[PDB]
Structures are given as structure tokens and as C-alpha cells.
Design a protein around this motif. Sequence first.
Motif, mmCIF file in Angstrom:
data_model
loop_
_atom_site.group_PDB
_atom_site.id
_atom_site.type_symbol
_atom_site.label_atom_id
_atom_site.label_comp_id
_atom_site.label_asym_id
_atom_site.label_seq_id
_atom_site.Cartn_x
_atom_site.Cartn_y
_atom_site.Cartn_z
ATOM 1 N N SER A 125 -9.420 6.898 7.945
ATOM 2 C CA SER A 125 -9.927 5.971 8.963
ATOM 3 C C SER A 125 -9.133 4.656 9.059
ATOM 4 O O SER A 125 -9.195 3.959 10.069
ATOM 5 C CB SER A 125 -11.407 5.669 8.711
ATOM 6 O OG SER A 125 -12.113 6.862 8.409
ATOM 7 N N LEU A 126 -8.400 4.318 8.008
ATOM 8 C CA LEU A 126 -7.640 3.076 7.960
ATOM 9 C C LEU A 126 -6.903 2.772 9.262
ATOM 10 O O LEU A 126 -6.088 3.567 9.716
ATOM 11 C CB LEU A 126 -6.640 3.130 6.805
ATOM 12 C CG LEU A 126 -5.968 1.840 6.336
ATOM 13 C CD1 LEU A 126 -7.000 0.859 5.800
ATOM 14 C CD2 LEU A 126 -4.926 2.161 5.266
ATOM 15 N N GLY A 127 -7.188 1.608 9.848
ATOM 16 C CA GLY A 127 -6.529 1.167 11.061
ATOM 17 C C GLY A 127 -5.727 -0.110 10.873
ATOM 18 O O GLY A 127 -4.844 -0.426 11.679
ATOM 19 N N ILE A 128 -6.024 -0.856 9.811
ATOM 20 C CA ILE A 128 -5.294 -2.098 9.548
ATOM 21 C C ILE A 128 -4.960 -2.338 8.073
ATOM 22 O O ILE A 128 -5.801 -2.155 7.197
ATOM 23 C CB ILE A 128 -6.058 -3.325 10.095
ATOM 24 C CG1 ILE A 128 -5.305 -4.623 9.774
ATOM 25 C CG2 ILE A 128 -7.480 -3.369 9.538
ATOM 26 C CD1 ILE A 128 -5.857 -5.834 10.495
ATOM 27 N N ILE B 215 -1.661 2.672 12.491
ATOM 28 C CA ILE B 215 -2.266 1.616 11.690
ATOM 29 C C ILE B 215 -1.551 0.300 11.950
ATOM 30 O O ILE B 215 -0.324 0.257 11.987
ATOM 31 C CB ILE B 215 -2.146 1.939 10.195
ATOM 32 C CG1 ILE B 215 -3.008 3.147 9.843
ATOM 33 C CG2 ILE B 215 -2.524 0.727 9.341
ATOM 34 C CD1 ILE B 215 -2.787 3.645 8.434
ATOM 35 N N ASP B 216 -2.315 -0.774 12.133
ATOM 36 C CA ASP B 216 -1.735 -2.105 12.338
ATOM 37 C C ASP B 216 -1.431 -2.843 11.024
ATOM 38 O O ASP B 216 -2.339 -3.102 10.230
ATOM 39 C CB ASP B 216 -2.677 -2.968 13.178
ATOM 40 C CG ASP B 216 -2.519 -2.739 14.675
ATOM 41 O OD1 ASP B 216 -1.475 -2.171 15.099
ATOM 42 O OD2 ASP B 216 -3.453 -3.151 15.409
ATOM 43 N N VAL B 217 -0.164 -3.181 10.800
ATOM 44 C CA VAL B 217 0.228 -3.888 9.577
ATOM 45 C C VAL B 217 0.569 -5.335 9.898
ATOM 46 O O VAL B 217 1.547 -5.603 10.599
ATOM 47 C CB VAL B 217 1.426 -3.205 8.845
ATOM 48 C CG1 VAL B 217 1.910 -4.065 7.675
ATOM 49 C CG2 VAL B 217 1.034 -1.817 8.355
ATOM 50 N N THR B 218 -0.244 -6.263 9.390
ATOM 51 C CA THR B 218 -0.109 -7.673 9.760
ATOM 52 C C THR B 218 0.447 -8.497 8.624
ATOM 53 O O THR B 218 0.503 -8.042 7.493
ATOM 54 C CB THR B 218 -1.437 -8.297 10.240
ATOM 55 O OG1 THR B 218 -2.403 -8.249 9.193
ATOM 56 C CG2 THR B 218 -1.980 -7.551 11.423
ATOM 57 N N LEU C 38 0.847 -1.178 0.000
ATOM 58 C CA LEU C 38 0.000 0.000 0.000
ATOM 59 C C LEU C 38 0.889 1.236 0.000
ATOM 60 O O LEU C 38 1.568 1.530 0.972
ATOM 61 C CB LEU C 38 -0.936 -0.003 1.210
ATOM 62 C CG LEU C 38 -1.869 1.208 1.342
ATOM 63 C CD1 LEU C 38 -3.181 1.012 0.568
ATOM 64 C CD2 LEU C 38 -2.153 1.496 2.793
ATOM 65 N N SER C 39 0.895 1.951 -1.113
ATOM 66 C CA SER C 39 1.729 3.126 -1.259
ATOM 67 C C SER C 39 1.341 4.171 -0.227
ATOM 68 O O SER C 39 0.242 4.143 0.333
ATOM 69 C CB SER C 39 1.571 3.711 -2.656
ATOM 70 O OG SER C 39 0.279 4.260 -2.812
ATOM 71 N N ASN C 40 2.255 5.097 0.020
ATOM 72 C CA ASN C 40 1.979 6.180 0.933
ATOM 73 C C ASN C 40 0.821 7.028 0.424
ATOM 74 O O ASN C 40 -0.016 7.473 1.211
ATOM 75 C CB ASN C 40 3.234 7.017 1.146
ATOM 76 C CG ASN C 40 4.245 6.331 2.046
ATOM 77 O OD1 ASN C 40 3.893 5.495 2.870
ATOM 78 N ND2 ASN C 40 5.509 6.686 1.893
ATOM 79 N N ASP D 11 5.178 1.050 3.923
ATOM 80 C CA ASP D 11 6.023 1.789 4.860
ATOM 81 C C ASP D 11 5.567 1.438 6.262
ATOM 82 O O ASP D 11 4.554 1.933 6.744
ATOM 83 C CB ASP D 11 5.897 3.292 4.589
ATOM 84 C CG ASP D 11 6.944 4.126 5.310
ATOM 85 O OD1 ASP D 11 7.627 4.923 4.634
ATOM 86 O OD2 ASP D 11 7.063 4.020 6.547
ATOM 87 N N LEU D 12 6.312 0.552 6.907
ATOM 88 C CA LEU D 12 5.907 0.019 8.200
ATOM 89 C C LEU D 12 5.786 1.087 9.279
ATOM 90 O O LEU D 12 4.731 1.217 9.887
ATOM 91 C CB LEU D 12 6.858 -1.092 8.644
ATOM 92 C CG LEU D 12 6.362 -2.539 8.524
ATOM 93 C CD1 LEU D 12 5.294 -2.691 7.464
ATOM 94 C CD2 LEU D 12 7.527 -3.507 8.295
ATOM 95 N N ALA D 13 6.853 1.853 9.506
ATOM 96 C CA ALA D 13 6.856 2.899 10.540
ATOM 97 C C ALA D 13 5.811 3.986 10.273
ATOM 98 O O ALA D 13 5.196 4.505 11.196
ATOM 99 C CB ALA D 13 8.244 3.514 10.678
#
Lengths: 277, 277
Positions: free
Chosen positions: A61-64, A85-88, A51-53, A76-78
Amino acid sequence: LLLVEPMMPFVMDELQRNYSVHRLYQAADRPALEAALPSIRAVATGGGAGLSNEWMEKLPSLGIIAINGVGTDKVDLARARRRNIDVTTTPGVLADDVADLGIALMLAVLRRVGDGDRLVREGRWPLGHSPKGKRIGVLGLGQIGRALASRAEAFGMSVRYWNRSTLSGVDWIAHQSPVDLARDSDVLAVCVDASLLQALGPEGIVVNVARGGTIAGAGLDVFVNEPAIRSEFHTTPNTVLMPHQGSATVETRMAMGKLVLANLAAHFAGEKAPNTV
Amino acid sequence: LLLVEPMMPFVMDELQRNYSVHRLYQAADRPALEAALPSIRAVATGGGAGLSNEWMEKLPSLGIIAINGVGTDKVDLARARRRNIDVTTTPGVLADDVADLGIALMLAVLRRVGDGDRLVREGRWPLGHSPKGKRIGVLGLGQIGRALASRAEAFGMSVRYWNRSTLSGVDWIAHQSPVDLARDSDVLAVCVDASLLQALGPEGIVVNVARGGTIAGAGLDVFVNEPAIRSEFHTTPNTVLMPHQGSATVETRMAMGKLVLANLAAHFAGEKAPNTV
């Protein structure tokens, strides 16, 4: 949610049940996708797309971000973290199957399963080699590495590996370095040179399962720059090739989808996703 | 001696050292072959050629027929016995490798190694199936049968078999009959119907290693009437084929040659050949 990529029809159905799904890739939901932007809290994607910046900034609203896979180079994890936002991901699910293909390719080269299959199919109908008592050198004794070694033990093969660290509980021998490994291997399994290739000798073979006449063969499922792949391979000899099918089984993809579903319902449940990275 | 068939160059060299070898198949030694008839005590041959009664009657001194193989249909066993000729074979040497090819073909169908290899080679670049947790039904739990089952255990497969008798020491389950076996198998290994094929279901596959859309695949190394083989196979789908390469490894052929040499020097040594049958 934002479905960046197609996944399996039945991972799809599990989504269209719990979720109103907008596929980035389908034109038929571009409008309703645009509409939904501010009320979109979830992205499902794969390692390749991420998912690009730009898109992230579009989703307030994106949380995950649930990754069907373990690849993180495409997000971009950080940055997500700073937006809270939680990246799983979907860990520990694909190694066995990647190790199966590695062995399958091995038997394939060892036993001329390609050259042998066409010659019957090409109505054209050379002695092969047994794995038994031959040194399998494993490059990278990780998950995939261990799986592949044990499977190789059943064929009467003696395991040697390069290492990163030494493994307790088995009688496999560790070699100091990759070239040390090559000089002591009959089949080299890449599970993480010219001189390495040269140390394998003219009887030895190389089997790739990770990234992209002096050797007797090679079974490659992964190549540099894909799928616009060298071309000489299809011409080369004693070669079995795969369209990067390491993890391509229904079971693995089903195991990965369920994980992706799990991190989803978790987050919408007010919890911290279990596969957050 | 009478060398009815070619064997490996280095089984050849082991012969031309100890023995004056007349090859039935080479025109360049037809004369000296004719000459030698009365002073010929040894025939080396293979299961396919054997030694006809006609030729046997031509060889008054013949005391041993050493078969590179275990096939006896091409030689009259009792007739040699009545002429006091020792007919030997090469037992217990090829089962493992036949079991290797059976597994190789299996992974090949399971993981689309044929369809996958050409699609890259045919510059054309479907999810496969994992063996793990799938029932492998083994038809004929002999030498080849046992070898193949243990190898299949390493892939996370549960063994079931048809039987002839029950095997102690393992936790494999026995089924009363072949159809019972099929109804309880995800992959059928033939190591010795329509209704059997039908009991395997649409996900199941058949793997041949012995003799000659309702199923999901098949890996066949042996077919009825060879090598003038059906033809539809090369056209069929989800099919991997082999030019009867069960035992075709250097190691196996070398193991078999040494046996053949052993029975030879034994007989010329005034002893009773060890592999007499």
C-alpha cells in the motif's frame, strides 16, 4: 506509518497524533508492525537509513517515502516511481546552519578556541590571527557557499570562490580552478590535495563542512569513514573537530520535521507531495 | 630606553635598531641599565606594568612613557605631566578583534564547539542552537559593542543594546536599562546579576569580553581575579573559556607596536607624541 528512524521527540509527537506509528527500531512494536504491513501507506525515514528494496516490496500500500533530509543514496528513486510511490525530501533548510558551523570552526582555528579552552580547563593558564583583510577562498559557491561567504564579509574578509558558475550581484572574484583558488586564499572553505594544501602556504587553513607542518590549521566537521575517524586528528595540532554537526540545530531539525509532516498530510490528502524528487 | 616588558620579537627588533634598549626584566642588562639611568629618556611598557613613581623618580631625563595598550591604572598620569613627561597609548586598534572573539565564543556555546570537540578527541563520538532570528542584547554599545553587533547581524540576529546613548544610522533598538536589555535578549553580550541572568531565561546565554541551571550557557574570556580563576568554570557545563585573548592577535599586537614606535620617534623628534593622554 513506518517510522524507520527516531526523529525529534516533538516531530514524534506530531506523528503519533495524526498517525499510528510503527517504529522499525523498537522491538515493542514488531508484532503490530508485522500486522500493519498491508495497511501501511507511509514511511518516514532519514537519508542515512532510506528504505531498502526488500522493505519496499513488503509494503504493497505504500504511497509515500518521506525523507527527513535530502540524501537519496539509501532509496531506489525510480523503483518507487514504478510502484507509483512519492519520495520526498526537505530542501533549502540547512545551508545557513552548516555555514554557521563553518565560520565557527574558522574563528575556532584562527583564534585558538580549542587550544585556548583546554589550557584554562587543564589549569595550564600563543597569539592568534584576525580574519580581517584575509582572503577567504570558498570551494563550491552553492547555498552553503554563499551563506558562508557573506558571513565572512562581516569579519572584513575578501571573498574569492570556485565556482561552477559566476554569481551576479556581488563583487566576489572567481578563480578558474581549485588550485587557482588555493594559491589565492588565506582560509580555504570546502563547501562542495597536497598541492592544494601546499598552495595555501604555512599561514593558511582548511575548513571542512561537506564530505570526508605545511598548513597552519584546520577545522573539520566531516571526515572520511565516520565516526571511526583517523585518530591522528585528536593528536594533530591546530585542529578543531566536530561530530558532523553541520545541521544539528533544533531549528533546522524542526524546519526539516515540519517539511516531513507537510509532505505526509499532503499525500494522505490525495495530493502530490510538494517535495517529491 | 627602558623596556619594562617583553613585547613581540619584531616590535623588539624595531627597538634594538633605533634604540639602546635596557630590559628591566632581564638580569643580563641590570648593570648597563643602572649606568644608563640619567641618560634614559624613554620607557616602553604595557598597561599591566605601567611605571611606578619610584622608577619615574629614578629617571631624570625621561620625557616619554609609551604604553603598549590603553590601560593607565599602572602609571600616575598627572605626576608625569608635572615632570613634563608625555604618556601615550595605542587607541582604536583592538576593538574589532575583541568583537571577533566575542562572536567566536558565542558560536562556540550556541553550537557546542567545546563539548563537541572533546567528544571526538576523547573518542566518545546533543542538538545545538542557531543564532538566526535570535535577539542579541549588547551591554555597552562602544567600539567593541558596535563591531560585535554588526557581525551578529550577518547571522540573522536582531540587535538590541544598552546604550549610554543612542546610535544613529542603524535600526537597532535601545533598552532603558540593563535588566530591560536582559528580559529582551537570547544572547547577552557584555561589552562595557542574578536577576539579569534570570531574565535571560533557561535558553539564553552570557558572553563576557570586558572585565570579571538557570541559563543555557556562557563564553567567558575575562574573569574576576585572573588567572587564579574560580575553578568551577572548568567544571561548569556549556561553557567555553579563554585565557583573556581579546586582543591577542598578531595583527592587533603589530598595530599596537607600530603605534608605540610612532609615539617614540615623534618625541625624540622634538614633537609632542600623537597618542599623549
